[PDB]
Amino acid sequence: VTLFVALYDYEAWTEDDLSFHKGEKFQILNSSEGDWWEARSLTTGETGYIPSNYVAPVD
């Protein structure tokens, strides 16, 4: 924790971004770039950039 949940599906298109689906949860490893955050998915066990407007905090 702190854990975020994916609100929508996202398909990667660059080299550092991560593909994910509605409902995957993430550990945010690095959140200092406003729009793009470094995450690890607790579902697929994978690491890469995700867009921040595509996740919400878990609660």
Side-chain angles (χ1 to χ4, degrees), residues 27-39:
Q27 194 196 353
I28 309 297
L29 314 167
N30 194 310
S31 68
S32 81
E33 216 82 353
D35 335 76
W36 295 93
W37 296 345
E38 208 179 14

Side-chain angles (χ1 to χ4, degrees), residues 4-20:
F4 290 66
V5 67
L7 296 169
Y8 326 107
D9 277 50
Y10 173 75
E11 176 153 298
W13 56 287
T14 277
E15 29 181 340
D16 301 318
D17 57 345
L18 184 69
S19 296
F20 58 77

